[PDB]
Amino acid sequence: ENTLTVKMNDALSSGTGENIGEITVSETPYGLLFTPHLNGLTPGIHGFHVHTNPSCMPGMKDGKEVPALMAGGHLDPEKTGKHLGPYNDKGHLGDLPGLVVNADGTATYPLLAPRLKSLSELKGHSLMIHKGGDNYSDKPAPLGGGGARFACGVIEK
């Protein structure tokens, strides 16, 4: 393909929740462009990453159900172990720019991830929108401060 469309749903401790739209991913000469067509989100910047597993299912951790835990960690085929954002090749390949949410809860602003070059790199993985933001660092909080997983979609094929 030259584009793909990822449906995004809210992540619940019990499974999958409300559909909040889709994200269209296209290839550009500068990398992958993520153009959201979403609603249902808190205004501001949200952590936004490709995660390793093609699942948005919840999982148990320290006694409690965690929404979208089965998506696994940030996509990291080079096993860097480091959350350094979309502009640093020393960290997770799955680190995308923060998702920008408008005051009415829609997300429309397009996001360029220059380190990703082909839609093939997304196949068999998941897209994640977090409750918190992303300062592209593991300091002062791990994983950019994204925290909990709010919405999720699977890229199959």
Rule CB under 8 A: say whether 141 interacts with a second copy.
no
Two structure tokens written together for 131 = 């409750």
- Binding-site residues from annotation for Zn(2+): 74, 83, 92, 95
3-state secondary structure the chain: CCEEEEEEEEEECCEEEEEEEEEEEEEECCEEEEEEEECCCCCEEECEEEECCCCCCCEEECCEEECCHHHCCECCCCCCCCCCCCCCCCCCCCECCCEEECCCCCECCCEEECCCCCHHHHCCEEEEEECCCCCCCCCCCHHHHCCCEEEEEEECC
The nearest distance, CB 65 to a second copy, in angstroms, is 31
Sketch the per residue contact string, 38 through 57, with Cu ion: x for CB under 5 A, - otherwise: -----------x--------
Q: Which is nearer to Cu ion, 4 or 126 (CB)?
A: 126
Rule CB under 8 A: say whether 147 interacts with a second copy.
no
Rule CB under 5 A: say whether 96 interacts with Cu ion.
no
Residues 14-43 that bind a second copy (CB under 8 A): 28-31, 33, 43
Rule CB under 8 A: say whether 139 interacts with a second copy.
no
CB 93, CB 125: distance < 8 Å: no
The nearest distance, CB 96 to Zn ion, in angstroms, is 9
Using CB distances below 5 to 8 A depending on partner kind, what does residue 41 bind out of a second copy, Zn ion, Cu ion, none?
A: none
Q: How far apart are CA 48 and CA 129, in angstroms?
A: 5
- Binding-site residues from annotation: 49, 51, 74, 83, 92, 95, 130
Binding site for Cu ion (CB under 5 A): 49, 128
Binding site for a second copy (CB under 8 A): 28-31, 33, 43-45, 86-87, 89, 97-98, 100, 102-103, 109-110, 112, 114-115, 136
